[PDB]
Design a protein around this ligand. Structure first.
Ligand SMILES: CCCCCCCCO[C@@H]1O[C@H](CO)[C@@H](O)[C@H](O)[C@H]1O
Ligand SMILES: CCCCCCCCO[C@@H]1O[C@H](CO)[C@@H](O)[C@H](O)[C@H]1O
Ligand SMILES: CCCCCCCCO[C@@H]1O[C@H](CO)[C@@H](O)[C@H](O)[C@H]1O
Ligand SMILES: CCCCCCCCO[C@@H]1O[C@H](CO)[C@@H](O)[C@H](O)[C@H]1O
Ligand SMILES: CCCCCCCCO[C@@H]1O[C@H](CO)[C@@H](O)[C@H](O)[C@H]1O
Ligand SMILES: CCCCCCCCO[C@@H]1O[C@H](CO)[C@@H](O)[C@H](O)[C@H]1O
Ligand SMILES: CCCCCCCCO[C@@H]1O[C@H](CO)[C@@H](O)[C@H](O)[C@H]1O
Ligand SMILES: CCCCCCCCO[C@@H]1O[C@H](CO)[C@@H](O)[C@H](O)[C@H]1O
Ligand SMILES: CCCCCCCCO[C@@H]1O[C@H](CO)[C@@H](O)[C@H](O)[C@H]1O
Ligand SMILES: CCCCCCCCO[C@@H]1O[C@H](CO)[C@@H](O)[C@H](O)[C@H]1O
Ligand SMILES: CCCCCCCCO[C@@H]1O[C@H](CO)[C@@H](O)[C@H](O)[C@H]1O
Ligand SMILES: CCCCCCCCO[C@@H]1O[C@H](CO)[C@@H](O)[C@H](O)[C@H]1O
Lengths: 309, 309, 309
């Protein structure tokens, strides 16, 4: 029974892929991390292939649904999950086949940049985006995609180009967040969108993870500054969690996985650098437990026919 | 005749304590600064003890008044003055008794973080905070408290944890200020709140003072950048001063003391580092004259029964 | 036939002067750049003298028109073009006469700082500036003027004072842009103002150019971060260009020249530093072609009596 794949489902392979990469970065300290990384990376890649095929089906047979999501000043953002996940799968595959990895990384980089250049800029024409369009999902095309390009290009050796993407993401983040948080303060995000509060966890941690990927894992003043704001936001979101899930636990909670996985990834670098190793251990374990709970809730939802539309 | 202590009065020991610390940092250049520092520190500590006892009385006998201030999306911020001043008094007392200092510093740090995690985040639920709630006082829990933790923890030797608090404050500052200044441009702050424009002086100077405390007094590019924006804001506030006091000079002007004291503190580090020593001298003298005028106006108000509620 | 000079016309000598300085910075790599720099610098200086004389005439004989522009919460910003161009002409003239250069640089620096301190701060009184006043032109007094002071003072040897102005501009930029872009998203900028979207190109490139001028041309992490966001904005504005010129090509397009010239200037430093030399060459050529097109369209407009009011 055909259905149009909800684009947000790409957050699942995104979170798993990012978590694979976190474990990969533990390999030199703890060799057993290699197997955990490889298993997460294969599962993420397989889910990504499936969802890419489903989205190709959506494009072929439900094109007007894609067109409507693209032109929406809110829903367009989830499309950025496609190139973001494509790059992360490339990053995973690099351990086995750098040529294929490089192809995926460049496709995702050119894709995300074309996407933002076409759609993010178009918002500045005014009159379509409304105050109520000011949602955490906007971080995906505006911020997360650039950080992912930055870290992926660094992996391929393009450190200076990586810094360009890094800067685009970092400054875009601090330029958007002020108006997002003011909007949230004034207007209550409706329950149907609240799981996307998890995306608010992502910026600082995705930022510092990308930064450390480009700067050879040097845990410097900037990295520590970023981690601090990251943890502030974590604490805030923990306090907000009962409100986030007021209307029940749902699959949208995968929104938190990107920030959680990036907190795990950045923890490996802090630990390697002998900076706040206790905090690093807590962060790494915490993020893995939470993503583990997402996986278990997702298997549960699947073993009952409550997964796809 | 019992009364509920207005929470804002903690700005008095706050400003005096911060100024004690500024003079403390002049000791190695000018030994006579020691006595001035110690006198300011004892006076600040004594006033703090008195106000803590008064607030304990408020909690015991005027609890509903505290509850109302806590739940207000505007008035809650002044409560952050309590842990901020507790930490600064700890910092003062460190010169005489590090054990007692450490207790006060940790109580104020855990207290402020718990306070923001409970209340600052709760605003993001929407519908309580309004555009008109966008006031300079929000810098206290969001920004100043984190900088104070950063510098206090650095004093105790916890430089990396200090950088985490520093980053939380710095990024929180740049995330809030944009919407504050836009709000002020559009909506005239009512005279009763205008003295709190003095808090707008604080961020850059409290930021750079905390930064220099953590980075061993190294006056680097970041420090100079911060000072520049700090002085811009000083100039702006000087030009605005007749509007700020349109309806008369009042005790609320202690709002300026935190930024003034932090400008004095940071001046000592610039001077030590042989950076802009002339500017440093001007800044240090200017801040002391202005706080001196606050003290004289406050003694005046007291010698007439116009101090407490 | 007397007329009041539209203040925005100062953008012409501004763009040409900035471009002269870009070519000046190519001299050590390519000696022929000297002549191109000198020709652009003489033309910019001559146009600046003419426009200064015209504005002096405006002040003498059309003072109420100046007063109205000054008090406008939108139109005041263009006045900042006067001290900005004065400083850039000083920077040009430094190659021939440092004494005269120093006079112009200090006049423009004191002038711009006095101007912002009087007018930018006055906006914070509220009730005059409206949401609809949130225009790209605000970058001129708030941001561009400080960067120009920073680079001009560095030229004269005042590197630490230069960093103060730099910081004031950089932090002012990130404090304003968030609310500008949110405003543009919600409200369509009217065609008559759209050419000023070109000013949105300026911040990152003017910032990095000023930074590199102060830090001895060291292309570091900050510089690369700035360039990245700069290019993001360039791409966005390229995509937006047909909307910008919906109602036709007009002389207001000189708004883009400051950012274009600064992109050329910063390219020379990236090239010198052997960072992204290919990107540097593209940027330098692109900016010169676009400004060349502005010059040709302007000569065209002049050879038909469609230049002044
Ligand atoms: C994965 C992303 C796919 C998004 C595709 C939607 C593209 C825009 O779709 C349409 O194309 C036509 C022009 O070519 C025009 O009608 C419109 O501008 C637009 O509706
Ligand atoms: C997400 C990975 C690649 C994204 C490709 C997006 C294709 C969009 O397509 C474009 O959308 C524009 C709207 O802004 C339309 O006006 C264009 O004519 C259409 O070509
Ligand atoms: C939005 C927040 C941005 C903060 C930027 C932090 C500035 C980085 O700080 C710099 O880091 C270096 C590396 O450790 C130090 O040596 C420098 O002295 C320090 O200033
Ligand atoms: C990124 C965070 C994950 C790193 C997990 C490390 C867990 C190991 O634990 C640590 O092992 C050390 C030696 O190997 C011991 O010295 C430590 O005392 C112990 O805490
Ligand atoms: C110094 C700071 C003191 C602030 C105390 C006010 C705390 C909240 O007070 C109340 O407590 C009850 C739950 O425990 C609930 O009614 C409410 O959420 C709240 O009204
Ligand atoms: C300022 C120094 C310590 C602050 C302690 C604050 C105690 C707050 O108390 C809490 O406030 C919440 C509201 O956000 C209530 O809902 C909680 O149930 C109540 O426990
Ligand atoms: C919000 C504003 C943040 C600006 C961050 C400034 C970046 C710091 O700058 C860095 O400082 C070091 C120390 O002096 C230098 O060596 C670096 O080369 C310089 O880029
Ligand atoms: C933080 C700013 C306060 C520092 C105040 C310093 C006042 C001393 O003044 C300075 O003393 C020097 C030697 O000690 C002399 O060389 C200087 O010429 C003189 O200006
Ligand atoms: C190049 C910049 C010139 C701007 C000049 C306009 C200055 C303000 O002009 C007027 O001056 C009078 C006070 O002196 C008062 O009426 C007003 O505040 C103001 O209208
Ligand atoms: C742009 C180069 C120099 C600028 C000088 C500006 C002169 C402004 O002049 C002033 O404007 C104020 C308004 O904010 C008025 O209230 C003042 O009384 C008037 O002196
Ligand atoms: C608003 C965005 C501000 C970002 C500030 C970037 C921080 C600068 O970064 C610092 O630059 C130095 C010079 O290359 C490095 O050595 C430091 O290790 C690096 O952190
Ligand atoms: C700021 C950007 C402008 C610099 C333009 C440089 C153009 C020269 O071009 C370059 O010249 C080099 C040697 O001089 C050759 O090695 C290069 O291959 C060639 O690309």
């Amino acid at each position: 029974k055909p259905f149009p794949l909800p684009t947000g489902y790409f957050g699942i392979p995104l979170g798993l892929a990012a978590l694979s990469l976190a474990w990969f970065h533990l390999e030199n300290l703890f060799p057993a991390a290699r197997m955990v990384s490889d298993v997460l990376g294969i599962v993420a890649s397989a889910v990504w292939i499936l969802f890419i095929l489903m989205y190709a089906y959506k494009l072929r047979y439900y094109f007007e649904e894609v067109r409507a999501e693209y032109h929406s000043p809110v829903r367009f953002s989830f499309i950025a999950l496609i190139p973001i996940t494509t790059m992360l799968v490339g990053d995973i595959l690099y351990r086995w086949n750098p040529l294929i990895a490089e192809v995926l990384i460049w496709i995702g980089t050119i894709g995300q940049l074309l996407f933002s250049t076409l759609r993010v800029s178009e918002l500045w024409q005014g009159g379509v985006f409304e105050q109520k369009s000011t949602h955490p999902s906007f971080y995906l095309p505006a911020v997360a995609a650039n950080f992912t390009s930055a870290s992926s290009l660094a992996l391929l050796g393009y450190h200076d180009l990586g810094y360009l993407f890094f800067g685009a993401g970092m400054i875009a983040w601090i330029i958007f967040e002020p108006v997002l948080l003011q909007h949230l303060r004034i207007s209550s995000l409706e329950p149907q969108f609240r799981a996307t509060m998890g995306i608010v966890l992502a910026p600082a941690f995705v930022c510092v993870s990308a930064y450390l990927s480009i700067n050879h894992g040097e845990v410097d003043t900037l990295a520590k500054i970023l981690w601090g704001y990251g943890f502030l936001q974590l604490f805030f979101l923990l306090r907000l969690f009962p409100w986030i899930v007021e209307k029940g636990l749902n699959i949208g909670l995968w929104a938190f996985s990107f920030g959680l996985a990036s907190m795990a990834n950045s923890a490996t670098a802090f630990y390697h650098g002998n900076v706040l190793q206790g905090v690093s251990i807590f962060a790494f374990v915490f993020s893995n437990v939470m993503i583990g709970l997402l996986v278990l809730m997702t298997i549960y939802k699947l073993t009952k026919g409550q997964f796809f539309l």
